[PDB]
Design an enzyme around this catalytic site. Structure first.
Site, PDB file in Angstrom:
ATOM      1  N   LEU A  18       0.770  -1.226  -0.135  1.00  0.00           N
ATOM      2  CA  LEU A  18      -0.041  -0.031  -0.157  1.00  0.00           C
ATOM      3  C   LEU A  18       0.839   1.248   0.076  1.00  0.00           C
ATOM      4  O   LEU A  18       0.330   2.360  -0.561  1.00  0.00           O
ATOM      5  CB  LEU A  18      -0.930   0.075   1.390  1.00  0.00           C
ATOM      6  CG  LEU A  18      -1.897  -1.087   1.507  1.00  0.00           C
ATOM      7  CD1 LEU A  18      -2.179  -1.162   2.931  1.00  0.00           C
ATOM      8  CD2 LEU A  18      -3.290  -1.109   0.436  1.00  0.00           C
ATOM      9  N   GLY A  19       2.089   1.192   0.521  1.00  0.00           N
ATOM     10  CA  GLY A  19       2.960   2.157   0.672  1.00  0.00           C
ATOM     11  C   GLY A  19       4.413   1.942   0.957  1.00  0.00           C
ATOM     12  O   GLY A  19       4.713   0.887   1.599  1.00  0.00           O
ATOM     13  N   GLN A  20       5.109   2.894   0.762  1.00  0.00           N
ATOM     14  CA  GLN A  20       6.918   2.904   0.941  1.00  0.00           C
ATOM     15  C   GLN A  20       6.977   3.871   2.005  1.00  0.00           C
ATOM     16  O   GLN A  20       6.779   5.182   1.582  1.00  0.00           O
ATOM     17  CB  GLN A  20       7.616   2.665   0.021  1.00  0.00           C
ATOM     18  CG  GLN A  20       9.247   2.769  -0.002  1.00  0.00           C
ATOM     19  CD  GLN A  20       9.434   1.138   0.547  1.00  0.00           C
ATOM     20  OE1 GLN A  20       9.513   0.347  -0.071  1.00  0.00           O
ATOM     21  NE2 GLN A  20       9.673   1.251   1.848  1.00  0.00           N
ATOM     22  N   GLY A  21       7.855   3.703   2.879  1.00  0.00           N
ATOM     23  CA  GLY A  21       8.298   4.559   4.015  1.00  0.00           C
ATOM     24  C   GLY A  21       9.792   4.697   3.962  1.00  0.00           C
ATOM     25  O   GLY A  21      10.459   4.072   3.268  1.00  0.00           O
ATOM     26  N   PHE A  23      11.657   3.808   6.938  1.00  0.00           N
ATOM     27  CA  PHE A  23      12.020   2.447   7.886  1.00  0.00           C
ATOM     28  C   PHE A  23      11.274   1.354   7.361  1.00  0.00           C
ATOM     29  O   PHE A  23      11.607   0.054   8.046  1.00  0.00           O
ATOM     30  CB  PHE A  23      11.751   2.687   9.331  1.00  0.00           C
ATOM     31  CG  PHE A  23      12.258   4.309   9.740  1.00  0.00           C
ATOM     32  CD1 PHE A  23      13.584   4.170  10.253  1.00  0.00           C
ATOM     33  CD2 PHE A  23      11.570   5.465   9.765  1.00  0.00           C
ATOM     34  CE1 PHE A  23      14.142   5.381  10.383  1.00  0.00           C
ATOM     35  CE2 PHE A  23      12.292   6.571  10.416  1.00  0.00           C
ATOM     36  CZ  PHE A  23      13.349   6.819  10.680  1.00  0.00           C
ATOM     37  N   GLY A  24      10.406   1.110   6.430  1.00  0.00           N
ATOM     38  CA  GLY A  24       9.796  -0.139   5.960  1.00  0.00           C
ATOM     39  C   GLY A  24       8.575   0.253   5.134  1.00  0.00           C
ATOM     40  O   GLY A  24       8.498   1.151   4.592  1.00  0.00           O
ATOM     41  N   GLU A  25       7.727  -0.979   4.971  1.00  0.00           N
ATOM     42  CA  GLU A  25       6.546  -0.579   4.156  1.00  0.00           C
ATOM     43  C   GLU A  25       5.287  -0.973   5.098  1.00  0.00           C
ATOM     44  O   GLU A  25       5.326  -1.421   6.135  1.00  0.00           O
ATOM     45  CB  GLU A  25       6.665  -1.833   2.894  1.00  0.00           C
ATOM     46  CG  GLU A  25       8.141  -1.833   2.274  1.00  0.00           C
ATOM     47  CD  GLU A  25       8.393  -2.927   1.398  1.00  0.00           C
ATOM     48  OE1 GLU A  25       8.022  -4.311   1.845  1.00  0.00           O
ATOM     49  OE2 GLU A  25       9.183  -2.764   0.387  1.00  0.00           O
ATOM     50  N   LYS A  40       2.516  -3.115   8.964  1.00  0.00           N
ATOM     51  CA  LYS A  40       3.700  -2.345   8.682  1.00  0.00           C
ATOM     52  C   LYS A  40       4.860  -3.180   9.240  1.00  0.00           C
ATOM     53  O   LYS A  40       5.153  -3.859  10.246  1.00  0.00           O
ATOM     54  CB  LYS A  40       3.389  -1.168  10.034  1.00  0.00           C
ATOM     55  CG  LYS A  40       4.599  -0.300   9.853  1.00  0.00           C
ATOM     56  CD  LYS A  40       4.363   0.820  10.617  1.00  0.00           C
ATOM     57  CE  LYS A  40       3.710   2.038   9.823  1.00  0.00           C
ATOM     58  NZ  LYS A  40       3.875   3.301  10.407  1.00  0.00           N
ATOM     59  N   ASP A 131       4.559  11.256  18.257  1.00  0.00           N
ATOM     60  CA  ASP A 131       4.591  11.629  16.770  1.00  0.00           C
ATOM     61  C   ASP A 131       3.203  11.807  15.946  1.00  0.00           C
ATOM     62  O   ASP A 131       2.852  11.194  15.131  1.00  0.00           O
ATOM     63  CB  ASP A 131       5.446  10.416  15.768  1.00  0.00           C
ATOM     64  CG  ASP A 131       5.893  10.836  14.500  1.00  0.00           C
ATOM     65  OD1 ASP A 131       5.956  12.034  14.179  1.00  0.00           O
ATOM     66  OD2 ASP A 131       6.597  10.183  14.153  1.00  0.00           O
TER      67      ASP A 131
END
Ligand SMILES: Cc1nc(Nc2ncc(C(=O)Nc3ccc(Oc4ccccc4)cc3)s2)cc(N2CCN(CCO)CC2)n1
EC number: 2.7.10.2
Length: 266
Positions: A18-21, A23-25, A40, A131
């Site tokens: 669903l997405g890329q960050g 520190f991970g996916e 996550k 955060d």
């Protein structure tokens, strides 16, 4: 000893990314071949497994309708964090997408009141998010907003969202989360814009320290900007509670701004 929330990696199917960050996916998948879940994934070395398990004991006690429900955990690297799947994803994605142009001030304040509700529970439970930002708020159907990644920041630093006492001296409290919420209000009223647009992290920290605060966003009522400024008071103890924020936002169009009328985008 196996934690009650610890599951084998094998019990999970990672179906759609669903997405890329950083520190991970984030994946959409299935747990035990019956439950639709969100997963996550964290790159090995980005988080201590033992420290996460200890922190996850507090998260297990947190049960609220406006908090993303934690389902399961994979403690072995790469760490997998399993929750309920949310239909529209991140609030930032939702605001920056096709839907953001149709969202007006009533819908945005409704979403803010839901986030304040989740955080008022966190406040009562004597916990800290660390955060709180649109990127860490999940959206589903009927504008259902849920607070995610609570207490994971402590385990790319968001200077623009962090209170001065927390960014400079590590004084992370529920009052630093209130500052972050005031910044989150800025993301809603500007429909996903980055706080302090055009300013680098160093300019933000130097200006906010000197007393600078973001101005009233275009066509945002002064009363809602005043609440943002209340969240941005220099003295953490002078900042309003989330309990107050929730109530103020829930009642906004009756007790504060009944003269409200739609503009260009708000
Ligand atoms: C990014 C994304 N996530 C989607 N749904 C999601 N539901 C849940 C997600 C999600 O982010 N889950 C998640 C799970 C575990 C996490 O770890 C912690 C949680 C709490 C405390 C500590 C750690 C953190 C986050 S992500 C759907 C989606 N869609 C569907 C809608 N599409 C069209 C636009 O509406 C775009 C693709 N895109």
């Amino acid at each position: 000893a196996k934690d009650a929330w610890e599951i084998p990696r094998e019990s999970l199917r990672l179906e759609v990314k669903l997405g890329q960050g950083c520190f991970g996916e984030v994946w959409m998948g299935t747990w035990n071949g019956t439950t639709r879940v969100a997963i996550k994934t964290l790159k090995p070395g980005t988080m201590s497994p033992e420290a996460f398990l200890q922190e996850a004991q507090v998260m297990k006690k947190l049960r609220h309708e406006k908090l993303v429900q934690l389902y399961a955990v994979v403690s072995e690297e790469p760490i997998y964090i399993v929750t309920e799947y949310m239909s529209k994803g991140s609030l930032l994605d939702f605001l920056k997408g096709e839907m953001g142009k149709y969202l007006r001030l009533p819908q945005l304040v409704d979403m803010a009141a839901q986030i304040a509700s989740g955080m008022a529970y966190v406040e009562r439970m004597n916990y800290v998010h660390r955060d709180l930002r649109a990127a860490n708020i999940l959206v589903g159907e009927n504008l259902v907003c849920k607070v995610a990644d609570f207490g994971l920041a402590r385990l790319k630093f968001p200077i623009k969202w962090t209170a001065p006492e927390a960014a400079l001296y590590g004084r992370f409290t529920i009052k630093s989360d209130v500052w972050s919420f005031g910044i989150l209000l800025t993301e809603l009223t500007t429909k996903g814009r980055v706080p302090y647009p055009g300013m680098v992290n160093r300019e933000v920290l130097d200006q906010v320290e000197r007393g600078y605060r973001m101005p009233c966003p275009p066509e945002c009522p002064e009363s809602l900007h005043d609440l943002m400024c209340q969240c941005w008071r220099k003295d953490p103890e002078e900042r309003p509670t989330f309990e107050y924020l929730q109530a103020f936002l829930e009642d906004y169009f009756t007790s504060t701004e009944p003269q409200y009328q739609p503009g260009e985008n708000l």
